[PDB]
Swiss-Prot record, chains A, B, C, D, E:
Subunit structure: Homotetramer. Dimer of dimers. In the homotetramer, subunits assemble around a central channel that can accommodate two ligand molecules. Interacts with RBP4.
Disease tied to this protein: Amyloidosis, hereditary systemic 1: A form of hereditary systemic amyloidosis, a disorder characterized by amyloid deposition in multiple tissues resulting in a wide clinical spectrum. AMYLD1 is an autosomal dominant form due to transthyretin amyloid deposition. Protein fibrils can form in different tissues leading to amyloid polyneuropathies, amyloidotic cardiomyopathy, carpal tunnel syndrome, systemic senile amyloidosis. The disease includes leptomeningeal amyloidosis that is characterized by primary involvement of the central nervous system.
Mutagenesis or variant effect for residue 77 to T: In DTTRH; increased affinity for thyroxine
Keyword annotations of the record: Amyloid, Amyloidosis, Cytoplasm, Disease variant, Gamma-carboxyglutamic acid, Glycoprotein, Hormone, Neuropathy, Phosphoprotein, Secreted, Signal, Sulfation, Thyroid hormone, Transport
Documented effect of changing residue 57 to Q: In AMYLD1; amyloid polyneuropathy and cardiomyopathy
Listed result of changing residue 22 to C: In a patient with amyloidosis
Residues annotated for L-thyroxine binding in this entry: 4, 85
Name of the protein this chain belongs to: Transthyretin
High-level lineage: Eukaryota, Metazoa, Chordata, Craniata, Vertebrata
Family per similarity comment: Belongs to the transthyretin family.
Disulfide bonds: none
Length: 91, 91, 91, 91, 91
């Protein structure tokens, strides 16, 4: 097994490289690679893995999730390598 | 097994490379690669994997999910390598 | 098994490469590659994998999902490499 | 097993490299690599893994999640190496 | 097993390198690498792993989470090595 990437480079490129070589109870995950170059923006979660036997008997639950409001996410060149260029965010 | 990628490069390119080589209980996931160059924007989740035997007997549940509001997501060049170009977000 | 990609490059191209080589209980997934260059925008989920025996006996459940509101997602050049070009988002 | 990356470089490129070589109870995760080049912005979570037997009998729970307000996230060149370029955030 | 990265370099590049070589009870995680080049901005959490048997009998719980306010996060060149460039945040 031989891998060659970008043997010779000349003249200033913008590069993003990711190399992975592999060889060979509510939740159980084993022997994994999570999140190479992962981006998460405005992620939400409610009631994850409460456990064994929640609200087993005679439970009265009221759940209300409200999401609102003025929120802004201005992004230029996300995960976007560039060269000899111009990037501007003018407001 | 031999792999060659981008042996000779000249003149400043913008590149995104991803190489993967492989060889050989509510939830169970094993021996996986999750999220190479993954992007998530405004992801939501409710009541994931509450567990074994939730609300087993005589449960009175009221669920209400409300999503609203002024929200903006302005993105230029997502996962988009570029060269000798112009990117602008003018407001 | 021999793989050759982009042996010689000259003059600044914008490139997106993805190479994959392979060789050989509510949920169970094993030995997989999930999400190479995956993009998710405004994804929702409700009540995923509640578990074993939820609401087993005499359950009174009221479910209401409301989705509304002024929301904007302005994107230029998603997963779209470019060169010698112009990208603008003017508002 | 032999790996060669960027054997010869000349002329000032901007590079992001990630190399990974591998060889061979509510929650249990073993022998994993989490978060190489991971970015998280405005992530929320509620009631994660409350434990064994929460609210077992005669529980009266009121849950209310409110999210609002003027919030801004202005980012230029996220995970985006560049060279001979111009990046500006003018307000 | 032999690994070679950036054997010869000339002319002042800006580089980010990450190399990883591997060889071979509410929560239990063993033998892992968490957070190489990890960035977290404005992350929140509520009620994580309260323990064994919380609110076991006759519990009356009122939960209210409010998030609001004018907050700003202005970032230029996050995880974005650059060379011969210009970065400015003008307000």
């Amino acid at each position: 097994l031989m891998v060659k990437v970008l043997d010779a480079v000349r003249g200033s490129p913008a590069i993003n490289v990711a190399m992975h070589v592999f060889r060979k109870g509510l939740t159980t995950e084993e022997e994994f690679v999570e999140g190479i170059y992962k981006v998460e923006i405005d992620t939400k979660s409610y009631w994850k893995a409460l456990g064994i036997s929640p609200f087993h008997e005679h439970a009265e639950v009221v759940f209300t999730a409200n999401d609102s409001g003025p929120r802004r996410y201005t992004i230029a060149a996300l995960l976007s390598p560039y060269s000899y260029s111009t990037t501007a965010v003018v407001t």
